[PDB]
Amino acid sequence: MNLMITLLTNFTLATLLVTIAFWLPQLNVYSEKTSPDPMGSARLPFSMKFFLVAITFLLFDLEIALLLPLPWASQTTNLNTMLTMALLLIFLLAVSLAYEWTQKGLEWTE
Amino acid sequence: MFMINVLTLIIPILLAVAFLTLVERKVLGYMQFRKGPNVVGPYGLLQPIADAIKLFIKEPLRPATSSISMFILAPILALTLALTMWIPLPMPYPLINMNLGVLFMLAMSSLAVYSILWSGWASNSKYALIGALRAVAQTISYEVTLAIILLSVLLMNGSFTLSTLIITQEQVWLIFPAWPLAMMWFISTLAETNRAPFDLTEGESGFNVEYAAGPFALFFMAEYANIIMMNIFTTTLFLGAFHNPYMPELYTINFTIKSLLLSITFLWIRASYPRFRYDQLMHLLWKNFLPLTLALCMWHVSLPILLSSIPPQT
Amino acid sequence: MMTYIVFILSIIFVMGFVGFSSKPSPIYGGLGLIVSGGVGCGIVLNFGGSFLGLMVFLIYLGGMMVVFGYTTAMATEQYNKVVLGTFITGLLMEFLMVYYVLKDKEVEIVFKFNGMGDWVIYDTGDSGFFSEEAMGIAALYSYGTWLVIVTGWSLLIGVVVIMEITRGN
Amino acid sequence: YPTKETAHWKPPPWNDVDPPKSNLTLNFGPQGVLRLVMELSG
Amino acid sequence: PFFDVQKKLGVDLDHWMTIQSAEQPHRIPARCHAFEKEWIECAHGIGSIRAEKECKIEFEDFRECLLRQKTMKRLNAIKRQRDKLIKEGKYTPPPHHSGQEDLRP
Amino acid sequence: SRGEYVVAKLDDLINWARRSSLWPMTFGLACCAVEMMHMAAPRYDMDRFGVVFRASPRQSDVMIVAGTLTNKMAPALRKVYDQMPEPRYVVSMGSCANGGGYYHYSYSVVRGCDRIVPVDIYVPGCPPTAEALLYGILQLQKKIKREKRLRIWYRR
Amino acid sequence: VAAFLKNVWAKEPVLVASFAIAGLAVILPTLSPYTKYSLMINRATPYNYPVPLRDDGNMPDVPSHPQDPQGPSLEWLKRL
Amino acid sequence: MSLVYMNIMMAFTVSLTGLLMYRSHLMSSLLCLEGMMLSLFILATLMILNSHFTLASMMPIILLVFAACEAALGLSLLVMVSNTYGTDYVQNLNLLQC
Amino acid sequence: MWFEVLPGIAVMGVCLFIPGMATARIHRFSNGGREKRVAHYSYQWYLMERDRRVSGVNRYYVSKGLENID
C-alpha cells in the first residue's frame, strides 16, 4: 500500500522534472537551426564479441538464479547434501568459466 | 503522514546530489594543488544553484531522434530507479521494511541499464549506439560479480533483510571476516556506477550525446544519486554502526559519517589513476575478479558449517 | 474497486500482451514485453510470491530482456495498418470479455470462470514463523538433488553449445 | 514432375554449401589539432 | 516405454514432488491434503478403469477442494439475492456485517 | 511599475546564473592554447570562478579560439560553432585569432576569426598572458552581467 | 612438481589463491569436528508445535512435563 | 474457477497467435515465444501459491532457467542467420524448398 | 586552506542526516511513542491483528495489560 504510493510519487516527481527540463526552453524563441558520428552513413558492423559476452552473462545469470536460495537452504537438517549440492553448483560455474577461458572465448575482450 | 516521510526522503537526496557536485569540485581542486569554486558564494556555496539555473535555461539540442518515446522514457527510468533504491535502506529504520530488500536492490540495479540502452538507441548516431552497447556490456558483466559477492556476504547474515544487517555487526564489523569480498565489492560498485578508472564514455562518444542540457543534467543527477546510494549500501554491508533503540540519532550520525567518508574515497580514487582500456577491465573482471569471487563464495558457504555458526533464519 | 486489484493488473497484463504481440517493431515489442513482465510480477507479488516476483525482475527483466534488447540493437537498423488493426481487435475482444464477465458474474469459453473478486480463494490461516514459498525454494539443495544435477548439466552444455555454433567452424 | 510453380527450383549444391553472399571506417575530425582516418576491424 | 529405473535401483529421483500429499518440509500441510489422501487410498491397486467409476465421489470432493466452483457459485447466488433484496428495500444488513461488531479476541 | 521591477530582478537572476557558470570549450590550435593551459594551472585557477576545465562542445557556453585559424581549419570551426546551444559567446585569444598576427599576409591563414564567427571579446597579445586571458574572461562576465533581455522583451 | 608451484605462484598468484581457497573449502568441512554441532543445532530448532502423544501406559522416556528430567537436553548448546 | 486464470489463459493465447503468424522479423517470433513462457510462469506460480503446494515452489525457477537457455540458443541462431544474410527477415530462410 | 571543503561536506551531512531522523521521529510519533512493529511473518501479523482487535480502539499500538482481566 505504502510501497506503491512511494513508487507513484517517485514516478510523478521524475516525470515532473523531465517535463520542466524539456518544455521550459521551448517557451524561449531563440532561433531556427538547419544543421546540414565519425562515420557518415556506414552500417553498424556486427561483432560476435559483444554478443558472446552478452550470452555468457545471461548463462551465468541463470546459474546465479540457481545459486540464490543458499542462505535459506543452509538451515536444512540435511547439511551434507546441501553442502555437496552447493559446492557442485559453484564448481559447475567454475568449469563453465574455465571452458570459456581455454577455448579463446574471452579474447580481445578478455 | 506517510507522504511527509516520502518527501523528506526524496528532497534531501536531490540536495545532497547538488552539494556532492560542489564537494567533488572543491576536493579535486584541493587535491590538484588549487582551489575549487570560491567566488560565486562564500566558499562556493552558491555554485550548484547557479549551475542548475544555467542548465535549465539552456537551449535544447532538438535532435532527429528515431523514437521520441524512449527518448522521453530513458531519463524517467533513470530518475525513478535512482530514487526508488533508497526506500529499504535502514537509517536505522527503513522507510519500507522489506523482507527481501537486498534482492530488491539487486533487481533495481539490474533494471538500471535500460536507460543506457534506450538513450543509445534513441540517438541517431551509430557511434553513440556503439558506446552505449559497450557501456551496457561492462555494466552487466559487473552485475555478475555484484550478485556473487552479495550472495557470499549474506551467508553470515542469514536472510535478505537489510535491518538484520545491523544486528549481525553488533559485535564486530563485517569487513573483518570478509575483507577480500569488501575490496572486490568496492571495485565492482566503482565500476558499476561508471566512475573512474572505469568511466570509458569520457575517454577516446557517450550514450547521451544528443540529449539536451536539461536531460543531461537529470542523467548526471541520477548517476550521483546512484553513487551516494551505493556508498550507503556498502557502509551498511561492511561497516555497520552501533544502534541504540532509544536513540536512533546515534546510528544516523555514525553511518552518515562513514558513508560520506566512503564517497570522499570515491572522489579520491577518481583523481589518482589513469583510465582502463575496455579489454583491460574485461580482463580484470572475467579473469581476475570472477575466479576469486567463486572461490570465496565456496569458502563462505562451507565455512559456517564447519564452525557451527549458522546464522538464525529469522 | 480496490478488491479487484489483481483482476485489474491481469487486464493490464493481457493488454500489454496484445500490444506487443501485434509486432510493431522488435524494440517496441521488447518494451511492451518489459511492461507486461513488470505487471505480471506485480500480480505475483499481490498474490504473496515475493521471491518469485523478485526472480522475475532480477532474471527475466534485468538479466534476459537486456540480452534481447541488446541483440535487437545490433540488428534492425533504425529509421502500420496491420499492427493497428490487430491491436484494435484484440482490445475489442478483451473488453468484450471483461463486460461479459462483470455483467453476469460467470462466463464460459473453454473452461467455466467466475466473475467475483479473486480474494475469495485465499487461505484463512497463518504460516507460522516462516514463509512457505521460501522453504519450498530452499528445499532445492536438500530434496531436489536430481533437479540440481540435470539443470546444472543443461546449463554447462548450453554454454558449450553456444560457444560451438557461433564460431563458424 | 516439374510444374509451373516448380520452375525456379534449382537443385541443391553438390557439397551442399551456399556462397556466403570489409571493415569499419571512422573519420575522426578536428573537433594541437589533427584529423585521422581510421580503418578499424572491431 | 516407461523403464522404471527408480524402482529397479531403489533410488528416489522425482517421487517426492509427484503428489501434493507427500512429505513436505517443516510438516507444512496443503489446502487439500485430506481429499487427496482419500482419493489416493481409493485408487491404489485397482487400476485406472476401476478407479474411474468405483469411488468417483472422492475425486469429486478433491476437485471441489482444488477449484471450488460450487462454493463460488453458491456465494454468487447468495450475494445476488442479497443485492436484489437490498435494492428492492426489504432487507436491512445486521450491525456485525457492516463493521460494528468489535470482534472476539 | 511592478512589472518592470519583476523583469529587472529576474534579469539580474538569470544574468547572475549565466555569468557565474561559464563552461568553456577551447580550440587547441597553437601557442595560445598552451597559455590557456597555463591559465588553468593552480596559480590562476580558472575553475574557482565557476569556469570549468575543458567542457564538452555540446554543453559549453563560451568558445575560446586560441591559435591560428588556417584555411583548412575554418569550416570545421564554423561547424563546431553552429552546434553550440544558445546563449553562446566567442573569445578571440592572441593576434592570430584577432587579425592574423605574424602570418597575416600568408596564403593559407584566415585574417582574423571574426571573418567566420561573431566575436565578443578580443584578447591582445602574442601570447597574451594567463593574467590577460583571465581579465578577458572576467570582462566577458561583466558584459553578460549588463544584459537586458527581459527588459527588452517587456518593452517590445 | 615443486618448482611448478613456485613458478605458477610467481606468475598467476590470483589463480593459485583461488584454487587454494577452493581446496580448503572442499576438504575442511569433512575434517572439522564442529559439523555435527551444526547438524544438531539445525535439528534442535523448534519451528512447529511439539504435538503430545496419548499416554497408553508404556512411555518411560517421554516426559509428562517440560521440567521433567527425561527428554532431550540442550545443555551442550548452552555451554558449547 | 477464478478470473485471473482466465486472463492468463487469454494472454497465453494472444502470445501464441502472435508467434504462429510471423510478420517480418524473427525477433518478433522470439519475443512472442518468450511472452508465452512468461504467461506459463505466472499461471503455474499462481496455481502453486494458491494450492499451498510447498515443494512445487521450485518449479517456476527451473522453468525460467530452461526457457532462458532456449532463448539464448535462439538468439545465437538469429545472430548466425543475420550474419549470413545481413538481416533477420523470415523470407530469406527459403533455400530448403528445393 | 583544506578546511574550506568543510561547509559543503557539512551541508551534505545535514541532508543525509535528515531522512533517517525524520523516519525515526515519524515512526515513533505515529505508533504511540514506540517503534514501528515489524511483521515479516504471518505469526507476527496475526499477533498484530489480535492486538488491534483486543485494543477496543481499532488501533494496534494501544496496548492493554493487567487492567483488563477480571
Ligand SMILES: CCCCCCCCCCCCCCCCCC(=O)OC[C@H](COP(=O)([O-])OCC[N+](C)(C)C)OC(=O)CCCCCCCCCCCCCCCCC
Ligand atoms: C570498502 C572498503 C575499502 C575497499 C578498498 C578501497 C581503497 C583501495 C582502492 C584501491 C585502488 C582502486 C582503483 C583501481 C581499481 C582497479 C585495479 C584493481 O583493483 O585490480 C585488482 C587486481 C587485479 O589483478 P592483476 O590484474 O594485477 O593480476 C595479474 C593477472 N595477470 C598476470 C593475468 C595479468 O587484483 C585482484 O583482482 C585481487 C583482488 C583481491 C584479492 C584478495 C585476496 C585475499 C587473500 C587470499 C589468500 C592469499 C594467500 C594464499 C592462499 C592461502 C590459503 C590459506
Ligand SMILES: CCCCCCCCCCCCCCCCCC(=O)OC[C@H](COP(=O)(O)OCCN)OC(=O)CCCCCCCCCCCCCCCCC
Ligand atoms: C539544507 C541546507 C541547504 C543550504 C543551501 C544554501 C547554502 C548557501 C546559503 C547562502 C550562503 C550565503 C549567500 C549570500 C549571497 C549574497 C547576499 C548579499 O549580500 O547579496 C547582495 C546582493 C547585492 O545587494 P545590493 O543591495 O545591490 O548591495 C548594495 C549595498 N552595499 O543582493 C543580491 O544579490 C540580491 C539578494 C540575494 C540574497 C541571497 C541570499 C542567499 C540565498 C540562498 C539560497 C538557498 C537558501 C537555503 C535553501 C534551503 C534551506 C531552506
Ligand SMILES: CCCCCCCCCCCCCCCCCC(=O)OC[C@H](COP(=O)(O)OCCN)OC(=O)CCCCCCCCCCCCCCCCC
Ligand atoms: C517578484 C519579485 C521577485 C522576482 C524574481 C526574483 C527572485 C529572486 C532572484 C535572486 C535575487 C535577485 C538578484 C540577483 C543578483 C543581483 C545582484 C548581483 O549581481 O549581485 C552580485 C553579487 C556578487 O557580485 P559579483 O559581480 O559576482 O562579484 C564577484 C566578486 N568580485 O552576487 C551575490 O552576492 C550573490 C547573488 C545571489 C543571488 C540569489 C541566490 C540565488 C538564487 C536563489 C533563488 C532561485 C534558485 C533557487 C534554487 C533552485 C534550485 C537550484
Ligand SMILES: CCCCCCCCCCCCCCCCCC(=O)OC[C@H](COP(=O)(O)OCCN)OC(=O)CCCCCCCCCCCCCCCCC
Ligand atoms: C516505461 C514504463 C515506466 C518505467 C518507470 C516506472 C517503472 C520502473 C521503476 C519502478 C519499479 C518498481 C518495482 C516494484 C516491485 C518491486 C518488488 C516489490 O514490490 O518488493 C517489495 C515487497 C516484497 O517484499 P516483502 O518484504 O516480502 O513484502 C512484504 C512482506 N511482509 O512487495 C510488496 O510490498 C508488494 C506490494 C503489493 C504489490 C505491488 C505491485 C506494484 C505495481 C506493479 C509493478 C509496477 C511497475 C510496472 C512497470 C515495470 C517496468 C516497465
Ligand SMILES: CCCCCCCCCCCCCCCCCC(=O)OC[C@H](COP(=O)(O)OCCN)OC(=O)CCCCCCCCCCCCCCCCC
Ligand atoms: C581442485 C580444487 C577445486 C577446483 C574447483 C574450484 C576452482 C575455483 C577457481 C575457478 C577458476 C576458473 C578459471 C580457471 C582457469 C585456469 C586455466 C587458465 O587460465 O590457464 C591459462 C593460464 C596461463 O595464462 P595464459 O594462457 O597466458 O592466459 C592469459 C592470461 N595470462 O594457466 C595458468 O595460469 C595455470 C593454471 C593451472 C594451474 C594452477 C595451479 C594452482 C595450484 C594451487 C595450489 C593447490 C590447490 C589445491 C587444488 C589442486 C590444484 C591442482
Ligand SMILES: CCCCCCCCCCC1=C(C)C(=O)C(OC)=C(OC)C1=O
Ligand atoms: C532539481 C534539480 C536540481 C539541480 C540539478 C542537479 C545539480 C546540478 C548539476 C550541475 C553540474 C555541475 C555543478 C558540475 O560541476 C558538472 O561538472 C562535473 C556537471 O556535469 C557536466 C553538472 O551537470
Ligand code: SF4
Ligand atoms: S598569437 Fe602568437 S602566441 Fe598566439 S598562436 Fe599566434 S604566434 Fe602563437
